[PDB]
Design a protein around this nucleic acid. Structure first.
Length: 453
RNA sequence: AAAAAAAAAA
């Protein structure tokens, strides 16, 4: 029921805004800096730690320059006498749940935290790429594709599971495979249920992302295997090479910083009355008139970091830059061209040379966020052009084989052409901001001079 | 109803 959904999302974002207002008011940040991105990431880490597990004191090799469970603080940067300064005394965590249950006066907002994580997810994904798994596990050159989705560091992401993308899901199989390559020998006993069941369900869902029943049954046949090994790994690798053209149903969730909902509940926003539309115009009209600023480091382009936060809010990193560009009204360039580093501020970075800058998060046109259209008609027909050469040498890849079975005939038939599906299809539904009812769409005209990625 | 377990980020 979409009605209760928009009701509940209005409620949760209203609760977020209220908790926003209060959480600020304690430490008393002035509202210009109270609607600012650094306090945005502070409250974000607070809601990151808000609902934890049992009490744990266990510590592992390589301490983290320290740790304390009594209370928790965050990077604090305040413009004092016109000059910013970072400071810290820590703040209790129980108190946090006490204030959060007051904000969600009687029923807490779990999906609210999921949506905050959604904010975090496009933030981190668009930010950059780390490769510590690369220094740990062996990995195929899938990165070479230059196109890969990524998950956040949040366990038990049942909701995340829906939005989730495919490539990193196979990677997650590989992560369990790493736990199993460093398998503690002393692990014989009841243990195995959670593992077998988890493998079952994750394999299920990774299969369920796409459509064609062939790879569905292939993924089931990898499932029924009792002892996952490198043969399963290479089978998943083919399946990934295919997923390149037979893309997965990777949905995109749009979320903004909480310093926007805060002044939006301060903007007399009766969210529930209109509801909210995470897939809808609502983030855009909220951002169209919002006011968010960010500590631009030295040698950084306000516009580049502006587009970075724009993508963090639109969940648009794994989308065609041409479309984004046509939607914002100014060229959306590859992250590499962004004269900017991460929005966060490493605790070592000096504040002496730090400066703030206004975020430009507006968009010329608006557009909806899908993952079905048979063939998007281009005025001069588009093809989703068939570049299948790296897949030629991929089907070669040392001439060993594809998935070895009837699948091999299925792949030596998929070789040529079937026109049965699409790939990386994020529906535009582009409209003028002056056309809220989305009465007339705008056939986009993209500049081919823009790196597709 | 009844559902898994470790470490900071350019």
């Amino acid at each position: 029921n979409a009605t209760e959904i928009r009701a509940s999302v209005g409620k949760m974002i209203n609760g977020i805004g209220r908790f926003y207002i209060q959480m600020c008011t304690e430490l008393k940040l002035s509202d210009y800096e109270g609607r600012l991105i650094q306090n945005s990431l502070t409250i974000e880490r607070m809601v990151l730690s808000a609902f934890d597990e049992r009490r744990n004191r266990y510590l592992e090799e390589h301490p983290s320059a320290g740790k304390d469970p009594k209370k928790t603080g965050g990077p604090i940067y305040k413009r004092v006498d016109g000059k910013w300064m970072r400071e810290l005394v820590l703040y209790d965590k129980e108190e946090i749940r006490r204030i959060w249950r007051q904000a969600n006066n009687g029923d807490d907002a779990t999906a609210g935290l999921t949506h905050m994580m959604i904010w975090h997810s496009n933030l981190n994904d668009t930010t950059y790429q780390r490769t510590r798994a690369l220094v740990r596990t062996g990995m195929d050159p899938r990165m070479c594709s230059l196109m890969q989705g990524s998950t956040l560091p949040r366990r038990s992401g049942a909701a995340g599971a829906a939005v989730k993308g495919v490539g990193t899901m196979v990677m997650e199989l590989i992560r369990m495979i790493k736990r199993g390559i460093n398998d503690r020998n002393f692990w014989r006993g009841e243990n195995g249920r959670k593992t077998r069941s988890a493998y079952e369900r994750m394999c299920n869902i990774l299969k369920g992302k796409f459509q064609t029943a062939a790879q569905r049954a292939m993924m089931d046949q990898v499932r029924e295997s009792r002892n996952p090994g490198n043969a399963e790994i290479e089978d998943l690798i083919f399946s990934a090479r295919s997923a390149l053209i037979l893309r997965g149903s990777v949905a995109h969730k749009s979320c903004l910083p909480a310093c926007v909902y805060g002044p939006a509940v301060a903007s007399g926003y009766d969210f529930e009355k209109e509801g909210y539309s995470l897939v809808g115009i609502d983030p855009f009209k909220l951002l169209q008139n919002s006011q968010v600023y960010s500590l631009i480091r030295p040698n950084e382009n306000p516009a580049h970091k502006s587009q970075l936060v724009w993508m963090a809010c639109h969940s648009a990193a794994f989308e065609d830059l041409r479309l984004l560009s046509f939607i914002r009204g100014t060229k959306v360039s590859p992250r590499g061209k962004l004269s900017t580093r991460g929005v966060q501020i490493a605790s070592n970075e000096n504040m002496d040379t730090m400066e703030s800058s206004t975020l430009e998060l507006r968009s010329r046109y608006w557009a909806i966020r899908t993952r079905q259209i048979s063939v998007q008609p281009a005025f001069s027909v588009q093809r989703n052009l068939p570049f299948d050469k790296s897949t030629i040498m991929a089907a070669f890849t040392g001439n060993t084989e594809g998935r070895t079975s009837d699948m091999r005939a299925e792949i030596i038939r998929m070789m040529e052409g079937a026109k049965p599906e699409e790939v990386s299809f994020r529906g535009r539904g582009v409209f003028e901001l002056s056309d809220e009812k989305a009465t007339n769409p705008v056939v986009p005209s993209f500049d081919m001079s823009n790196e597709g990625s």
